Amino acid sequence: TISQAVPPVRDWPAVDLPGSDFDPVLTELMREGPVTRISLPNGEGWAWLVTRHDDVRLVTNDPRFGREAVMDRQVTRLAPHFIPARGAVGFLDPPDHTRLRRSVAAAFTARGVERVRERSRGMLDELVDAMLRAGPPADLTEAVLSPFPIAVICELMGVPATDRHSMHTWTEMNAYFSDLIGLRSDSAGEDVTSLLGAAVGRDEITLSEAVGLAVLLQIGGEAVTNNSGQMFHLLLSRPELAERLRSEPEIRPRAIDELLRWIPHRNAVGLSRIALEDVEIKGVRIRAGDAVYVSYLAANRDPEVFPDPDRIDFERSPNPHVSFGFGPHYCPGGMLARLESELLVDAVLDRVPGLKLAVAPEDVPFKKGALIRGPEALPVTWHH
């Protein structure tokens, strides 16, 4: 019966957070209740926000919330603008979205990404070989964390090599993939570009649709560069973590998933969803048309799902984190990201004698005015 007053609209200004420190404003919101309302720097008005693990899964996996409708107005957001108007996989719903994700799904499953494990391991060794030959002072990001993800995706996409330059500038290729995809599009290849090529041939997807997806995947590696950057900043600044991984290599896969759960991958929240019809969440009525954001970072610190949520526990048993999202729009690169992280931890922790930061932890530069958090550089040193 009794009316439940709507939450006050909380303003969430863009703030550059140090290292991997948690956003105090998000903490405030997490403590206010499961359903809040926020207003970000750009776009207009307010949007709902859910922070609990169960509500985050509900909103991201329920058909009643859509992505296409976000383009119908200026939904309050962190990013200055929403250039990927239409066509981008993130802004598509079940009909078109499903066709697009299905065309390449097989290459990104656990078994799919295992295809490039061997070659990727070798590619990483060449990068580490070079860093070691050059001598101790090194920016781990520039020498390994940045180039490795790019090399890996090229192998998975089924592209030869030199596409990196364009990738770094993206900080051209649209035309490149248009060629490869639309000029080979029917081979039974297993690589991503072949799969897309084939799909386009079977009228499953459009050439433009295929190119757009190809571009997102090709440059999605920076996410691993930034995230793994935080992983190593943590492993080096907190030696007990690195020493446990050197002491018990068997725990590396689980440790990596725990690091992925904890690391605050982005600033604020990303892309909202629109309630296509009225929806009830924890006694709150979300009206059709309202925007609803989910915070995967907050969800990953849910005290019920992850007891002692702020502690990094490599032995954490049930670890259903949502760092790669949830629902239909869940990250296609999640399995590939775990593979890259696994190879990186192996190489960095086993092949660099006496590895440590070349500066105080607080002196490592992190990206400012960014959407995805991470170091701009990670200076390290070791015994030559």
Residues within the interface to ligand HEM (CB under 6 A)? 60, 89-90, 101, 153, 216-217, 220-221, 223-224, 227, 265, 271, 296, 323-325, 329-333, 336-337
Q: How far is CA 6 from the centre of its chain?
A: 31
- From residue 134, give the alpha-carbon distance in Å to each of 143, 146, 280: 10, 17, 59
Look at residue 358 and give the partner it binds from ligand HEM, ligand SPK, none, a contact being a CB closer than 5 to 8 Å depending on partner kind: ligand SPK
CB of 289 to ligand HEM, least distance (A): 20
**What is the dihedral angle through the alpha carbons of 210, 213, 214, 218, rounded to the nearest 10 degrees?**
180
Of the two residues 101 and 233, which places its CB atom closer to ligand HEM in the complex? 101
β-strand pairing of 35-39 with 9-11: parallel
DSSP SS3 for 29 = helix
- From residue 295, give the alpha-carbon distance in Å to each of 10, 282, 299, 321, 357: 15, 16, 6, 12, 31
Look at residue 217 and give the partner it binds from ligand HEM, ligand SPK, none, a contact being a CB closer than 5 to 8 Å depending on partner kind: ligand HEM
CB of 135 to ligand HEM, least distance (A): 30
Look at residue 296 and give the partner it binds from ligand SPK, ligand HEM, none, a contact being a CB closer than 5 to 8 Å depending on partner kind: ligand HEM
Site string for ligand SPK, 324-363 (x = CB under 6 A): ------------------------------x-xxxxx---
- Cβ atoms of 291 and 274 closer than 8 Å: yes
Q: Is residue 331 a known part of a binding site?
A: yes
Burial 125-136 (b: 16+ CB within 10 A, else e): eebbeebbeeeb
In terms of Cα–Cα distance, which of 238, 218, 191 is closest to 333? 218
CB of 247 to ligand SPK, least distance (A): 17
Q: Is residue 266 a known part of a binding site?
A: yes
Give the CB-nearest residue to ligand SPK: 354
- Cβ atoms of 229 and 378 closer than 8 Å: yes
Q: Is residue 117 a known part of a binding site?
A: no
Of the two residues 358 and 370, which places its CB atom closer to ligand HEM in the complex? 370
CB of 134 to ligand SPK, least distance (A): 15
Q: Which stretch binds ligand SPK (CB under 6 A): 145-153, 236-244, 268-276, 375-383?
A: 375-383
Side-chain-side CA neighbours of residue 380 (13 Å):
30
In the numeric block, the tokens 């490599």 are attached to 314
CA max distance for the chain: 72
Q: How far is CA 198 from the centre of its chain?
A: 27
Of the two residues 242 and 299, which places its CB atom closer to ligand HEM in the complex? 299
Q: Which spans of this chain sit near ligand SPK (rule: CB under 6 A)? A: 354, 356-360, 381-383
Feature table: binding site for heme:
331
Residues belonging to the binding site for flaviolin are 266, 271
Annotated binding site: 266, 271, 331
